[PDB]
Structures are given as structure tokens and as C-alpha cells.
Amino acid sequence: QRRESWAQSRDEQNLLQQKRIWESPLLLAAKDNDVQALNKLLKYEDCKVHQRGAMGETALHIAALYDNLEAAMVLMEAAPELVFEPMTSELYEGQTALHIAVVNQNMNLVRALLARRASVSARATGTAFRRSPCNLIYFGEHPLSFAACVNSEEIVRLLIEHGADIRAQDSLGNTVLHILILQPNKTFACQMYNLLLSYDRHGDHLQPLDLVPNHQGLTPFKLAGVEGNTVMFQHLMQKRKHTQWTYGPLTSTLYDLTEIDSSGDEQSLLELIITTKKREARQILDQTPVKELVSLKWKRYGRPYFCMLGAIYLLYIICFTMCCIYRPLKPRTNNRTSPRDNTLLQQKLLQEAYMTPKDDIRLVGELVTVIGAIIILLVEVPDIFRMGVTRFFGQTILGGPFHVLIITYAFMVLVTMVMRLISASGEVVPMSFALVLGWCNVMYFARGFQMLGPFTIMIQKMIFGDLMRFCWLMAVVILGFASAFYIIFQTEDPEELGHFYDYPMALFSTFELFLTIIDGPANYNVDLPFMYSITYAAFAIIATLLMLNLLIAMMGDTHWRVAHERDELWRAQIVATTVMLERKLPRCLWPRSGICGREYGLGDRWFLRVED
Amino acid sequence: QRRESWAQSRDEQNLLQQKRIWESPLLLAAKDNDVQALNKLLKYEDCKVHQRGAMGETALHIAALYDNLEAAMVLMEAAPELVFEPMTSELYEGQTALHIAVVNQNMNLVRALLARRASVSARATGTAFRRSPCNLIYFGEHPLSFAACVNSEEIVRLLIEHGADIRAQDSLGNTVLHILILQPNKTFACQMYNLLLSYDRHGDHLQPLDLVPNHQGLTPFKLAGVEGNTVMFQHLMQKRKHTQWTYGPLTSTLYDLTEIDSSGDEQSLLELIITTKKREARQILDQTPVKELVSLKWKRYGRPYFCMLGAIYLLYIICFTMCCIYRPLKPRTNNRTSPRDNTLLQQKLLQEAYMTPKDDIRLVGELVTVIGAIIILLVEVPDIFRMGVTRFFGQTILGGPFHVLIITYAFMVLVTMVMRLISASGEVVPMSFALVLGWCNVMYFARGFQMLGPFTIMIQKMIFGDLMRFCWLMAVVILGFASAFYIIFQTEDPEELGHFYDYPMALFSTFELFLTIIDGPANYNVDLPFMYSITYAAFAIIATLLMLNLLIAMMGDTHWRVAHERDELWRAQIVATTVMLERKLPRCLWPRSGICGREYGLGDRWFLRVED
Ligand SMILES: CCCCCCCC/C=C\CCCCCCCC(=O)O[C@@H](COC(=O)CCCCCCCCCCCCCCC)COP(=O)([O-])OCC[N+](C)(C)C
Ligand SMILES: CCCCCCCC/C=C\CCCCCCCC(=O)O[C@@H](COC(=O)CCCCCCCCCCCCCCC)COP(=O)([O-])OCC[N+](C)(C)C
Ligand SMILES: CCCCCCCC/C=C\CCCCCCCC(=O)O[C@@H](COC(=O)CCCCCCCCCCCCCCC)COP(=O)([O-])OCC[N+](C)(C)C
Ligand SMILES: CCCCCCCC/C=C\CCCCCCCC(=O)O[C@@H](COC(=O)CCCCCCCCCCCCCCC)COP(=O)([O-])OCC[N+](C)(C)C
Ligand SMILES: CCCCCCCC/C=C\CCCCCCCC(=O)O[C@@H](COC(=O)CCCCCCCCCCCCCCC)COP(=O)([O-])OCC[N+](C)(C)C
Ligand SMILES: CCCCCCCC/C=C\CCCCCCCC(=O)O[C@@H](COC(=O)CCCCCCCCCCCCCCC)COP(=O)([O-])OCC[N+](C)(C)C
Ligand SMILES: CCCCCCCC/C=C\CCCCCCCC(=O)O[C@@H](COC(=O)CCCCCCCCCCCCCCC)COP(=O)([O-])OCC[N+](C)(C)C
Ligand SMILES: CCCCCCCC/C=C\CCCCCCCC(=O)O[C@@H](COC(=O)CCCCCCCCCCCCCCC)COP(=O)([O-])OCC[N+](C)(C)C
Ligand SMILES: CCCCCCCC/C=C\CCCCCCCC(=O)O[C@@H](COC(=O)CCCCCCCCCCCCCCC)COP(=O)([O-])OCC[N+](C)(C)C
Ligand SMILES: CCCCCCCC/C=C\CCCCCCCC(=O)O[C@@H](COC(=O)CCCCCCCCCCCCCCC)COP(=O)([O-])OCC[N+](C)(C)C
Ligand SMILES: CC(C)CCC[C@@H](C)[C@H]1CC[C@H]2[C@@H]3CC=C4C[C@@H](OC(=O)CCC(=O)O)CC[C@]4(C)[C@H]3CC[C@]12C
Ligand SMILES: CC(C)CCC[C@@H](C)[C@H]1CC[C@H]2[C@@H]3CC=C4C[C@@H](OC(=O)CCC(=O)O)CC[C@]4(C)[C@H]3CC[C@]12C
Ligand SMILES: CC(C)CCC[C@@H](C)[C@H]1CC[C@H]2[C@@H]3CC=C4C[C@@H](OC(=O)CCC(=O)O)CC[C@]4(C)[C@H]3CC[C@]12C
Ligand SMILES: [Ca+2]
């Protein structure tokens, strides 16, 4: 409602702009190329040259919009004050006509305005210029930023000659080199990037203008990685690579690897690409400094430390499994209630549970599971206190779904610990969750293997893709037929056919008949009711044939899509593991990657050598 | 038989045409370019120049058919009356030779006929010129219509100079601008469309000739949408769009949206595209006025009103389900007939059914289901009285299959209402239909969701595609093997293996063995008959392996075809919903789309603004 009222207000204000032009002979003669009408209109007063349209625009703005050079020249000669006028409206605050002629690439009217001393530092701070999905252009705020984004190299040279600050930042802190990365035509933005670094002749040289961050802390090199700009990433790596020698077909290149790999506790380029929402960012992982660095970290220190943790976790779940197998049980102390009561054993009290030497061996195994579950909560839960408590930890959970599965496992172990201590009934329900969550967390360590790794991306995309959007159609066919199956057998004896004896069992039986994992109900010794055969024949056609195989056909497409991009998806699993594993392990266990300088006359930087 | 006798009569009349030419020296010398023979033949009388062929043709028609200019000139000089002669035959009534030279594009013979004052208003009303599947050309009735369709711009200019009525309509009411849309070469028809609007210089200007309807009420703009002419639709929208401004790469266009969106109670362009048989018409839904209008109606008012009705219907079916769960049942009053009688409960009488406070809570829930079923019939059934009673409501049912599923649900609720009142046995059969039709109508509201929506197009196309044409082969393999299975066990005791104990159960068991949803019959404690193992091994290979997986392979192709055109099929579901929902809800709930004029100096029209 709010996004649609903003689009409705922008449309009504654009129609009100065209109305106010037609209502006044001044702005209408600026819109058309009526030179003689602007001559005759201006002869009888100052003639309200400071007349505002619906957008806060003047007539000199209107001649700038419609590329009316001869109309705009008359207005500047009559009123030279119109050159310094911004648009006064929230949609276009601060926009002058020097902005408009730059965007329209009117070369003669840019020189005409700067001859009348037009400001090159005027900031278009209106809401039609901000970086938003509502806006189709993000050109920045300054006329040098507008000229760089329309690829007018001759205006970019002409604005810097008149004093345009090349280091100017907008509200987002973006310099002109940041804004060029955010542009759709990426080949032209490479050429404009080179032209604007050529004017950095120690101009406010605290930083060389390709090292200036925005308010997010991103330089143009890091912004090209976060936004998935692979064209600008290859172009900006040419400054960061150094050819050592060329021996025929061979070449030894030395890569800078300073802004790619984390120097201190700042987030590196690898951490930003993993933790971003754009999926074009993960094509930077296939680039010639970055692909070699990821393979180097994994083979040297990533995969040994990951297979050590996978073997410790696999021994831990085997210890948890056996203390659930040997859980303390005794024969039941009450008598059987109904003939449907199948329970023979109940669970011992806490005083009874630890009395034999086999109960003390289990107690050692049970304390390992408790201590291991506390260590999981001491490692993984303090992330929510360091990160955002709700929001920023939420992208960690959308990023890694195995975070919550080992957190939920660790809470289920501590729930059944408390039930052990207070002697509460029903420890089978915390244990059964912890058994299946404990063993299905071993599928986390499948990503140590190129072949096994993206199988869990298939399992994820079949659940939260195919299943989560087709289960709503399945649930409503189950609810329809299970309700029919319930009332058909509601008058019958359940001892012969008891699949639908109460309504929760009729729901569970129809779900199992859907998936064809129990057989169709049949007796052949009694007369089943007449509507059963018609309803189950209709169920067997729509559910077991049609809608079950429809889901299997969907998941076969999900298999095919993930197996196509299989190696690209495994490399993203490796970066996310290596980032996590380097962050949590100390620097003594993780040596820094590449070769450092300072013993080779190269600085304090850390270099990576590729021979190609 | 009737379509084939008409093709047989047209073929015999075309062979009789070539016979009558060869039988007469006049028409044979017109067919060939025998100038000296037509000279010598014409010297001995008037010489029967008014001689009719099999098609009612003259010799001047024959010289026009075979592009014989020098033969046709001799015939006009000898007989000037032959210029005014139409063909006198039902297949070619009214066709003159000015029609024939125009179609053959004989430039010299068109000028030669109009020099002899040939009629440009002659109407070819024969059955070979009407719009029919029997005819390969539909060129209209007038020579200006024939010249526009053969793309002869020089004849079109030359016929208008001699007084051709450009506003002339044929039997279908089609002007020359209507007929150009019905032509296969669409690029040439765009150029001929522009040339014929250029001659509308206030000529009978009640309407500008692109606003003249045919007898179906369609203008050329609406006819391009109904016929799926996307080339002519983009060309005719250029008159209906207005560029407000151009700001560098940006452009603001204002679209007319008058003939696209419904002004009054007339059918709009969106209603005509949904309710038409052609499926090329639904490519108009992806066009730049229409795609933005559909997304605007759905996001503002379509999807809120559709999810309100989906939540009210979902609460209604839950109320219907629980009054079927708690239906009035008592223990049976008679004794058990046979040992196959499994019935324990029967249903209470009407006097017994409402005696407790829990029966009055159900009575409130049962009256909600009755009132809701009457409202479904008061909303949906009066369409058949407003539309066609049989025919035109039939395309509504072929268009929406969820119309009949909620009508059949509403009748099943009122059948079990009457059985409740008269205390009739067997309310389980109207309830079981109403339970599965009630809950599977919740799949109607899946089309509020882009992902869930065209799942029901898959379910439809697998039933009425794959299943309805392969069930005939399955039914005959079931009937063959169930008859064999019946007579094999006809001499056996059914207490051990009773799958085929009578012939309706042998049919039902073999259907379930086909679908592999009951296990294969086996005892292992008795000797089964010898032909069972041979027949069931043959059944398991042809039916469970081969013909079951053959159907699953078909439906996997139906899945792949619908998932390919997935978003194009969901947008057609949204237009059909929005059309239905705007028609039934009052105008106070549905504001009209776009921005109106009259506060912006644009008229009383309603405009839609796209910034691109
Ligand atoms: C990939 C493979 C790798 C290896 C996997 C090995 C797989 C096989 C593993 C084991 C073999 C299978 C069971 C052997 C059979 C009986 C053994 C026994 O004496 O149990 C006794 C008690 O034992 C317990 O209560 C165990 C509960 C805690 C186990 C943890 C020990 C603590 C060590 C912490 C270590 C830290 C962990 C590391 C943390 C990082 C009782 O047994 P019972 O009553 O005589 O049973 C009758 C059986 N029957 C009916 C069949 C007759
Ligand atoms: C392991 C041994 C250690 C013992 C040491 C000390 C313990 C000693 C304590 C008591 C001794 C008494 C004997 C109890 C025996 C077993 C209890 C049982 O299951 O059945 C019992 C019911 O009791 C319950 O089931 C309680 C319900 C479970 C509550 C737990 C919620 C989990 C919340 C956290 C997870 C949130 C998950 C959400 C995630 C999304 C018995 O009732 P019954 O079986 O119904 O009898 C009828 C049988 N019939 C149905 C066949 C007719
Ligand atoms: C915050 C700590 C909890 C408070 C501690 C003291 C509790 C004081 C309460 C009762 C004390 C009186 C003793 C009588 C015996 C038990 C009777 C009883 O009331 O048990 C009840 C509690 O059972 C539970 O559900 C425990 C789980 C609750 C909180 C989870 C633990 C937090 C661990 C961190 C993880 C959090 C993350 C969760 C994510 C999964 C349920 O009863 P029952 O199950 O139906 O069995 C009946 C047993 N009887 C038949 C033998 C009689
Ligand atoms: C105690 C209980 C255990 C603990 C709690 C368990 C919580 C769950 C664990 C981890 C949850 C962590 C976040 C969800 C996973 C991320 C998915 C995602 O990226 O977004 C997804 C949507 O997003 C959703 O669907 C929202 C989740 C729905 C509700 C969560 C409960 C689901 C039940 C879970 C049980 C499932 C039933 C199976 C049998 C039981 C987008 O999908 P995608 O994956 O990015 O790509 C697929 C789309 N594609 C096909 C077009 C390509
Ligand atoms: C994707 C997943 C969706 C879930 C799928 C399935 C949901 C299942 C999940 C959980 C159900 C299991 C609950 C167990 C507790 C018992 C209570 C019970 O249900 O039975 C009770 C009955 O009461 C009813 O009949 C309520 C159901 C009516 C229909 C509402 C469906 C809810 C989903 C709507 C949304 C649909 C969403 C579809 C898209 C919009 C008691 O039954 P009884 O014992 O026989 O007693 C009868 C007494 N009698 C003999 C006098 C007659
Ligand atoms: C997506 C989810 C949304 C919500 C879905 C909620 C899902 C769950 C919904 C409900 C919970 C499931 C049942 C609860 C269990 C018993 C309740 C009870 O007292 O029933 C009593 C009578 O009740 C009836 O007869 C009901 C029949 C009419 C229902 C409609 C009410 C009228 C309101 C009109 C409203 C207008 C509707 C709107 C129209 C637009 C009898 O019960 P019992 O004999 O004691 O049963 C024994 C059970 N046992 C064997 C297990 C012991
Ligand atoms: C819900 C409670 C409310 C009650 C209130 C008032 C009601 C009180 C009224 C009577 C009380 C008497 C007790 C009756 C008990 C149930 C009746 C029954 O099913 O079986 C009965 C047969 O009776 C029939 O089935 C009649 C046949 C059905 C006709 C309906 C046609 C539907 C037409 C429209 C739909 C068109 C669909 C077409 C669409 C394409 C009993 O016979 P039996 O069971 O065979 O016994 C032998 C058992 N054996 C086979 C196991 C050997
Ligand atoms: C037009 C209204 C109908 C006339 C009203 C009065 C009818 C007068 C008739 C008998 C009155 C005598 C009373 C004795 C008790 C019943 C005996 C009997 O003959 O019942 C018969 C009628 O059962 C039906 O099939 C009813 C359905 C017929 C028309 C559908 C209703 C129209 C609703 C609009 C929707 C239309 C759309 C349809 C699309 C689905 C069948 O008998 P039974 O089922 O085998 O059960 C025997 C019961 N007994 C064992 C207890 C004895
Ligand atoms: C009380 C009973 C309930 C109420 C009455 C029920 C009446 C039915 C409900 C709605 C019917 C409304 C019209 C039919 C649906 C439209 C289909 C259509 O467009 O034409 C189709 C042919 O057309 C036919 O096949 C004619 C229908 C056959 C007879 C109808 C009974 C079918 C039984 C229904 C039970 C099915 C068995 C399943 C399990 C039981 C063309 O197919 P398509 O879809 O356009 O595209 C597929 C072709 N493609 C794959 C090449 C792309
Ligand atoms: C796509 C859907 C097609 C449907 C497929 C399935 C159709 C089935 C649908 C409905 C059948 C169920 C009816 C129930 C009523 C009982 C009557 C009955 O059938 O059994 C009776 C037998 O009589 C027969 O044997 C008739 C069948 C002979 C073959 C004709 C097949 C019809 C389809 C032809 C067109 C094929 C189309 C294929 C393509 C051209 C009684 O049997 P009994 O009780 O054992 O008594 C025997 C007494 N004895 C012991 C003395 C020996
Ligand atoms: C008494 C002692 C011997 C118990 C031993 C316990 C270990 C088996 C536990 C302790 C901490 C656990 C770790 C805590 C946190 C993590 C991070 C976790 O990361 C993710 O799941 C990322 C999610 C994703 O990217 O999808 C993977 C499991 C792991 C290594 C755990 C593996 C199992 C560990 C080593
Ligand atoms: C006792 C019963 C009732 C417990 C039910 C258990 C389920 C809730 C568990 C068991 C298996 C689990 C799944 C096992 C594997 C995966 C893949 C995993 O996918 C990834 O994270 C892959 C992405 C990547 O590797 O980068 C996401 C969680 C998911 C779907 C799990 C979700 C939770 C599931 C369905
Ligand atoms: C006592 C009261 C509270 C009962 C409430 C009854 C409602 C749940 C009913 C009344 C009228 C029904 C509507 C009547 C007609 C239609 C049109 C119908 O349109 C189609 O099915 C189009 C078919 C297709 O395009 O495939 C969809 C269901 C709907 C909205 C129905 C939805 C359910 C409604 C709102
Ligand atoms: Ca089985």
C-alpha cells in the first residue's frame, strides 16, 4: 500500500508537471523551440522568469529537459539568475539545469551554462536520484557523477577543467568510482574508471581515490565483488597483479592479495561475497586471484581441520546414540488400562537409574553428551550477542541452515538432561528429535567432498522449494479424502479395517496412502461400504498416480539444476566453511595465506604467485 | 460428410471450368495469349461475348485470370459491356474482372478497366471469398480490400483516385482496416494500415475509421487483440502512447488505456482475450500497456480481495468438515445379516438427531454450510440466465473448470440437506462427494501465488490430456486380466485368496494391482492354481512395469511443458481472476485503474504512466 501510494504520487506529480507547462506561455515556449515567442513574452516585465512548475522547475530547466538550446540561450540572457536555480520539490531537490544538460549530453548547453558560472558542486539530493528500486537510474548527486554514468567523456573532461571535485561523495558516501560500478553498461564503465583515475594527481592524497570507502566501508574494489561486477573485478585486478617473467608460453604473475584476504579483524572480500544477498557475487569465486586462494586455503588447512571436526562429531553422535540405546527402563508398575495399551516397560526413576556398574559406564557417556552440547552452545550462540540479536543473525540462519540444526540438537540434549534430573516422563520425545537431528548433522560434513557436497543443496532446494510450495495442494487433497474415508467407515467395525478409526488416524493413513507406503485397505472377508471403492479409486488416480509423480517430476528438475552448477556450488560451500573456520580457530593454527614481502623487497603485503 | 461433399463439389466445378474453356474457341483464346485468334473469332457476329463458363465467367474474366493483357484489350474493344459483368455462380458471386486484375496485380489491366469505367464498389459475395476454413484467402468483398491484402500500394492509391469507398464494409462488417489484421503477412499489413489511415480526411467522420466496429463490435484495435496479432497490436499502440519527457536514458510514456480497460459495461480488451478460443491472443498480455495494467490491478485490489475470499472459503470448509465428522449416528437396530456384514452404527432419525446441546452447536454449523451453499448458487448459477443458457455458458465451463466443482459441491450440500429432512439413508454418498469437492476447491486459490498457481494447470493437463487418452488402453488391459484372474480363482476357496471373489472385486483388485497399491495375491499355505502365476507374471510386466511407467513418462512431459511456460500461464490466471472479480464486486470496492484526466488537461480518459 505504501509502495503503491508512492508510485501513485509520482505519477500524479508527473502529470501535474505537464499541466503547468501548458497553463503558462513561458514554460510552453521553453518546452517547444519557440524562440520568437520567448522573445515576445520577455519584453513586458521581468515577466516572472522565477516561475515554478510542479517539480520546482524553472523555464531554463524546461529548455534543458527538452534539448532546446536556442530557447535556453534566450532565458539565460534575460535572466542570468536562472542558472543558479535548483528544483524545489522532494522528488528532485537540488537539481539544476547543469544536471539536466549533462544527462541529456547537450554539449553546447553545458558550455553555455559554465560560461554563466554554473556550479559544478550542486547536489541533486531528490528522491528520484537515490539508490532505490523505485528509481531506474542511480547517477549520484554531482554533475561529474551524472556525466560519468551517461558515458560522456568530453563533458567529464570539461567539468574537471571548471573545478569539479573528483573526490565528492553523495549521501551514501559513494565517490564517482563507486557509482560507475553500480551501472548496467559495464564495458563503458571500465573506460570511464580509467579516465577518472588519470585525474588523481595527488589531489587530497590521503587515499588514492580507489581506496576511499563509502559509508559501508567498501572501496571500489570491494564494491565490485559485493555487487557481482565481474567485468570491473577483472579490470581492477590489473592494478593488483605484477608479471615477474615470461618464458615463452609461460608467465609468472604475482597477485597483491591484500584487499582480497583479511589483514586484521576487518571483513575481507571472501567474507563479503558469502554474506551478501546477490548471487552474481559468487562469480568472483572463479577469478584468477580468488580461485587459487580458495583452493590453497582448503587443501592446506581447511580440509584437514574440517575432517578432524567431522571425525570428532561422528564419535560424539555414536556416544550419544549408545546412551540412548541403553537408557534406564524397568517393567511397568501399573496394570494395563485398555486392550489398546501396548506399553510393557516404563522408565526408571533417577535413584534407580544409576545403581549398577553398567549404569556408571553410561553415566560417563551421558556426561560427554551434556558437555558436548554445552560446548555447541558456548561456540555458536554467542554469535547472536556479537552480531545483531535478531536481524543480522537471521541472515546467518538463512545462510547456514545447519547452524540451527546443531543448536536445536544441543537444546534437545539439555531438555532430556533436565527431564533426567527431575524424573519427568517422556524423555523419548526430546531424544527422538536429538537422534535424528544429531545424525542428520553429519550431512554438514559432506561438503568436505567435491562429489558429496552439493547433495545437501539438492535436499535443501527440494524441501524449501518443491515441497514447501506443493505441500499445500497435497494437504488439501489429503484433508478432502481423509474426511471422506473417515465418514465412510464411521459406521463400520474397526476390527476388520481400522485405517480410519478416528480422525487423526484417517489423516495419517491417507498421507501414507498418498505416498504409497502402506497398502490400500482391504479385507475381502467382509463387505466394505460402497463409497469406499469409488473414493479410493478416485484417490488412487489423483494422489498416488498424478500428484505424487508430479512432485517427483519437480524434484527431478531441482536435481538437474543443482547438478548443472555443481562445482560452482561446492566452491561456495568451501569459502563459507573456510571463512567460518579461520574466524573461530586461532592464528597459530591458521597460517596466513600467500608469501609475505619484507624478505623480498615487496613491502609488508602478502602475495600469491600464479604460473600460467 | 457435409464438409467433404462441399470440397467434392468445389473440385468438380473447378474441373468443369477447365472443360468449358477447352470446349469453346473464344474462352480458349482468352486463356492462351492468342491475339490473332481472338481477332479472327470476333469478326463474324457479336460472337457470343456474353458467354458463361462453369463459374459464371466471361472471356474477359478468363483473360484476367491468366494475366493475358493483349487478349483482354481485344475483348473490351469488341465488347465494352464485359467490364461490368460479374461472375454468376454461388462460389464466385459478384466477382468482376476488376477484382481479378487487382489480385493478380496486373497494373496495366487495372488502368485499362478503370478507363472503361469499371466499378470500384463491386462486391464479391461468393462463398470462395468469405472468412471460412474452407477458403485459404479472406480478402473481403471490395477491390480496395483485395488490393490491400495483396500488398499493392500503387493499386490502392489508384483505386482511391477513382472513388473507392475506404469505409466500405463486407458481410461481416469488416472495413479494410479489419481485414488487414486477418492477414498472414503481418509486417506488410502494418504498412498498408498506415497508408489507408492517411486517406481519412474527415471522410464520413462520425468515427475515424480505426474506431468503426464490425458486427461483433470490434474495432481494429480490439480485433488485433482477439486474433493474437501482436505485430499489429504494437503498431496500433503507437497512436495510443504519448511520451512526456526523455531524461537521458529515461523516458516517461503515458498510455491511453481507454479501449484496453473497461469504461462501462462493455467487454474490454482483457475480457475478450481471456474468453477467446485462440491462444495467440494471450501474448497480448505481455505487452507494455497491458502487462503493467494487469500487475497493477492484481497487486492493488486483486490479490487482497482474492485472499479474503480464500480465507473465508477455507473457514467455511472447516465448518463443513466438522459437521460431517460429528454427524448423527446411533447403534444399529437390526441384527447382523451375514458374516460379511461389518456395519455397527446407523444414522439417527431427524427427531433423534437434535436433542442435546452438542446437537445444537452442530445445527449452527450445519446452517452455515446450507446458507453458504445457497449463496454459491445465487452468485454462480444466474450467469446461465444472463449468458447463453447452453452454448455461451459452455465456454465458461471449458474456460473455468472450478466453476462446476463449486456448483457440484453446492448441490451435494443441498442433496444431503434434503436427505437430512426426509430421513433418507445414505447421506455418506452426498457427503463424501462434498468433502472431496469442497477441499479440492481450495486449489482454486492457489492461483493467488506465482509459484503455486500453474500447478493446477499441470493437474488439469495430466487428467484431460495424458489420463483421458491413455485410460482406454489401461481399461482394456484391466478388463482382460481381471476376467482371467476371475475365472482362475472361480473354482477356489475365497477365504485364503479373496481378491477376485466376484467380478466387480476382480476389476477393482486388478486396477489396484495395476497401480501397485495393493500387494500381489499370495498365500504360500495353499496351492494356488497354475495359471495364476503365468497370468500374474504377464500382468506384472505389461501393466506394472510397462504401461504404468509409460503413463508416468507422459505426465513428466506435461510437467515439463507447463513449467516451461509457467509465468505466461500464471498471468493468464490473474487476468481471468481480475476480470471475474471486478465484474462481481461493486465499483466502490474496485477503483478504476490508472490516472484520469480532467485535472491535468487530458480529457475524460484514464491514463497509465510507464517510466522506462
Ligand atoms: C565408524 C566406526 C567408529 C567406531 C564406532 C563403534 C561402533 C560400535 C560401538 C560399540 C559396540 C556396540 C555395543 C557392544 C555390546 C555391549 C557393550 C556393553 O558392554 O554395554 C554395556 C553398557 O554400555 C553402555 O552403557 C554404553 C553407553 C555409553 C557409551 C559411551 C562410553 C563412554 C566413553 C566416552 C567416549 C568419548 C566419545 C568421543 C567424543 C568425541 C551393557 O551392554 P549389555 O547389557 O550387555 O547389552 C546386551 C546386548 N545384547 C542384547 C545384544 C546381548
Ligand atoms: C529414558 C529413561 C530415563 C529415565 C530417568 C528419569 C525419568 C523417570 C520419570 C517418570 C517415570 C514414569 C514412566 C514414564 C515412561 C515413559 C513416558 C511416556 O512416554 O509415556 C507416558 C506418558 O508420559 C508422557 O509421555 C508425557 C508427555 C511428554 C512431555 C514431554 C514434552 C517434550 C518438550 C520438549 C521437546 C519439544 C519438542 C518440540 C520440537 C518442535 C506413559 O503414559 P502412556 O504411555 O500413554 O500409557 C498409555 C499407553 N497407550 C497410549 C499405549 C495406551
Ligand atoms: C528452565 C528449566 C525448566 C524448569 C526446571 C524445573 C521444572 C519444574 C517442574 C516440575 C518439577 C516437579 C517434579 C515432578 C516430576 C516431573 C513433573 C512435571 O511437572 O514435569 C513437567 C516438565 O517436563 C518438561 O517438559 C521439562 C522441560 C521444560 C523446560 C525445558 C528444560 C530447559 C533446558 C534448556 C533448553 C531450552 C530449549 C528448548 C528447545 C527444545 C512435564 O510433565 P510430563 O513431561 O508430562 O511428565 C510427568 C512426570 N511424572 C508422571 C513422573 C509425574
Ligand atoms: C525441532 C525441529 C527441527 C528444527 C527446526 C526445523 C527448521 C528448518 C531448518 C532450518 C531452517 C533455516 C532457514 C530455512 C532454510 C533456508 C531455505 C531458504 O533459503 O529459503 C527458502 C524459502 O524459505 C522458507 O521456506 C522459510 C522456511 C519455512 C519454515 C521453516 C520450517 C520448515 C520445516 C522443516 C521440515 C521440512 C519437512 C521435511 C520432513 C519433516 C527458499 O528456498 P531455497 O532452499 O533457497 O531454494 C529452493 C527454491 N528453488 C527450488 C527454486 C531453487
Ligand atoms: C502443509 C501442512 C498442512 C497440514 C495438513 C493436515 C493438517 C493436520 C495437522 C494436525 C491434525 C492432528 C491434530 C491431533 C489432535 C486431535 C484433534 C483432531 O484433529 O481430531 C478431532 C476432530 O477435529 C477435527 O476434525 C479438526 C479438523 C477439521 C478440518 C481442519 C483442518 C485443519 C487444516 C486447515 C488448513 C488447511 C491448509 C491447506 C491449504 C489452505 C477429534 O477427532 P476424533 O478422535 O475422531 O473425535 C471425533 C468424535 N466423534 C466420534 C463424535 C465424531
Ligand atoms: C487454518 C486453521 C484455522 C482454524 C481451524 C480450526 C481447526 C480445529 C477446529 C476445531 C477443534 C477440533 C474439535 C475440538 C474437539 C471437540 C469440540 C466440541 O466440543 O465438539 C462438540 C460438538 O461440536 C460440533 O458439533 C461441531 C460441529 C459444527 C462446527 C461449527 C460451529 C458453528 C460456528 C460457525 C462458524 C462460522 C464458520 C465461518 C464461515 C465463513 C462435540 O465434541 P465431542 O463429542 O466431545 O468429541 C469427542 C472427541 N474425542 C473422541 C477425541 C474425545
Ligand atoms: C449422516 C447422519 C444424519 C441422519 C439424519 C436422518 C437420516 C435417517 C435415515 C435413515 C436411518 C436408517 C439407517 C441408515 C444408515 C446409513 C445408510 C447406508 O449407507 O447403508 C444403508 C443402505 O442405505 C443406502 O445406502 C441407500 C442408498 C444411497 C442412496 C443415495 C443416492 C445419492 C443421490 C445423490 C448423489 C448423486 C451422486 C452422483 C455424482 C456423480 C444400510 O444398508 P447396508 O449398509 O448395506 O447393510 C448391509 C451392510 N453390508 C453391505 C456391510 C452387508
Ligand atoms: C426435488 C427434491 C426431492 C423431492 C423431495 C421429497 C422426496 C420424496 C421421496 C420420499 C419421501 C418419503 C419419506 C421416507 C424416507 C425416505 C425414503 C425415500 O424414498 O428416499 C429416496 C429419496 O432419496 C434421495 O435420493 C433424495 C435425493 C433426490 C433429489 C435430490 C434433492 C434435490 C436438492 C437440489 C439439488 C439437485 C442437484 C443434484 C446434484 C447432486 C431414496 O431412498 P434411499 O436413499 O435408498 O433411503 C431409504 C430411507 N429409508 C430406509 C429410511 C426408508
Ligand atoms: C460429481 C463428480 C464431480 C463433478 C463432475 C466432474 C467433471 C470434471 C470437472 C470439470 C469439467 C469441466 C470441463 C472439462 C475440463 C476442461 C479440459 C479441457 O480444456 O478440454 C480437454 C478435453 O476435454 C475433455 O476431456 C472433456 C471432459 C471429459 C468428460 C468430463 C468428465 C471427466 C471426469 C473427471 C474425473 C477425472 C478422473 C480423475 C480421478 C477421479 C483438453 O485437455 P486440456 O486440459 O485443455 O489440456 C490437456 C491436453 N494437453 C496435455 C495436450 C496439453
Ligand atoms: C475408461 C473407463 C472404462 C471402464 C473400465 C472398467 C469398466 C467397469 C465399470 C463398472 C463395472 C461395475 C458394475 C457394478 C455392478 C455389478 C455388475 C457387474 O459388472 O458384474 C456382473 C457380471 O457382469 C459382467 O460381467 C459385465 C462385464 C462384462 C464385460 C463388459 C465391460 C464393460 C466395459 C466395456 C467397454 C470397454 C472400454 C475400453 C475401450 C473400448 C455380476 O458379477 P458377479 O457378482 O460375479 O455374478 C456372477 C454370477 N456367477 C457367479 C454365476 C458367475
Ligand atoms: C566432550 C567432548 C568430547 C564433546 C565434543 C563435542 C564436539 C563434537 C562439538 C563441540 C563444538 C562443535 C562444533 C560447534 C560449531 C560448529 C559450526 C557448525 O557450522 C555450521 O553448521 C555452519 C552452517 C552452514 O554453513 O550451513 C558446524 C558444526 C561445528 C563445527 C560443531 C561440530 C561439533 C563440535 C566440534
Ligand atoms: C523426530 C522427527 C519428527 C524430526 C524431524 C527431522 C527433520 C525436521 C529434519 C531431518 C532431516 C533434516 C534436513 C537434513 C538436511 C538438510 C539440508 C540442509 O541444506 C543445506 O544447508 C545445504 C546448503 C549448503 O550446504 O550450503 C538444510 C537443512 C535440511 C533440509 C534439514 C532440515 C531438517 C530436517 C528435515
Ligand atoms: C454463511 C456464510 C458465511 C457462508 C460463506 C460462503 C462463502 C465461503 C462462499 C459464498 C459465495 C462463494 C463464491 C461464489 C463464487 C466464486 C467464483 C468462483 O470462480 C471460479 O471458480 C472460477 C473458475 C475458474 O476460473 O477456473 C471461485 C469461488 C467463489 C469466489 C466462491 C468462494 C466462496 C464463497 C465466497
Ligand atoms: Ca505392501
Residue numbers in the entry:
A (entry chain C), B (entry chain B): 24 to 635
Tell me, in the authors' exact words, what the paper reports.
TRPV6 is a calcium-selective ion channel implicated in epithelial Ca2+ uptake. TRPV6 is a representative of the vanilloid subfamily of transient receptor potential (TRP) channels that is considered the principal epithelial calcium channel for Ca2+ absorption in intestines and many other organs. The channel is assembled of four subunits and contains two main components: a TMD with a central ion channel pore and an intracellular skirt that is mostly built of ankyrin repeat domains connected to each other by three-stranded β-sheets, N-terminal helices, and C-terminal hooks. The TMD is composed of six transmembrane helices S1–S6 and a re-entrant pore loop (P-loop) between S5 and S6.
As a control, we aimed to determine the open (apo) state structure of human TRPV6 (TRPV6Open) at a higher resolution than that of the previously solved structures. Initially, we improved the structural resolution for hTRPV6-CtD purified in glyco-diosgenin (GDN) detergent from 3.26 Å49 to 2.69 Å. The new open-state structures have the same architecture as previously published TRPV6 structures. Consistent with previous findings, the pore of the open-state TRPV6 was in the conducting state. Typical for the open conformation of TRPV6, S6 was not entirely α-helical and contained a π-bulge resulting from an α-to-π transition in its middle.
